[PDB]
Amino acid sequence: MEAKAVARTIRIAPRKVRLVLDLIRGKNAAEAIAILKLTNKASSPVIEKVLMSALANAEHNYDMNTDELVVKEAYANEGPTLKRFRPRAQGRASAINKRTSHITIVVSDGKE
Amino acid sequence: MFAIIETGGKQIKVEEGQEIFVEKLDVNEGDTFTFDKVLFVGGDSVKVGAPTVEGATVTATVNKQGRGKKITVFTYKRRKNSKRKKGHRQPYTKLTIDKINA
């Protein structure tokens, strides 16, 4: 059928996450769990949680099975932007952007 | 067998059953206009001729007498303060053919 799950205000930029997604989009679940769960980065824990969480809600609420579950689409969008500033020479400043994110996964089975 | 006619200041090729557009004639719908100037009719019995081949008459129906697509005019000189803009539609008259030369 359809299924999804979300994470919001996650304290990572979009891009660094977006690469990791481009290792995902199209696969089957089990594989993608593995793919995330091995690569040594900071996003892999998070996406792993959100993915398996999505399978959780799909299982409990919608009563699916796990074989045919595939990643229909996934994408991360921009979030609030905690402006900071690091000092710098000659009496000046420079405003860092501590970025955020809103991760979106939509697990699907494809059938009814 | 087709023939060549005159209208406005220009000409058209017509085969019988064909449609045409042309600048306005100011003759309402269904009032079948009949041309009087013709310049050529070929095919089988070929008759090229003097201007206004005589004995030659076309008939046709006035389907629609509408208006055109509003093209924009616009233009300007550069680095100066000048410009202009004024649309212009066009009237036309839409005919199809019965009875190539009488």
Binding site: - | I4, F40, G42, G43, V48, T72, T75, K85
Partner: protein, 116 residues
């Protein structure tokens, strides 16, 4: 009574930008650039209508001469043959004739060649 100048500006700017559909990069989203590119467009039209008339006169002449090289009647001998014959038509009909039917054109050239 102060006047919030809003509520029109955006609308005007949409009436511009929506004449920028098919333009490249940031020319189809931004007001400024699409304004000035539009103005180039309208001007270009105002020379292009003229230009198409010039063009198709060239084209028709080209095709016609490509016909009358068959009888080795270079294009000018012909036309002078036509003004002398006491007949005259446009171009584009010599084109469509000499494209869709050959024989008719041949009979024209006979009618003109014999006036020289």
């Amino acid at each position: 009574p102060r006047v919030k100048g809003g509520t029109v500006t955006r609308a005007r700017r949409k009436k511009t930008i929506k004449l920028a559909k098919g333009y490249f990069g940031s020319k189809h989203t931004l007001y400024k650039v699409a304004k000035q590119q539009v103005m180039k467009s309208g001007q270009y039209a105002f020379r292009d209508r003229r230009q198409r008339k010039r063009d198709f006169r060239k084209l028709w002449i080209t095709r016609i001469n490509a016909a009358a090289r068959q009888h080795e009647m270079s294009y000018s001998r012909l036309m002078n043959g036509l003004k002398k014959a006491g007949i005259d038509i446009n171009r584009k009909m010599l084109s469509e004739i000499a494209i869709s039917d050959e024989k008719a054109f041949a009979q024209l050239v006979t009618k003109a060649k014999d006036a020289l």
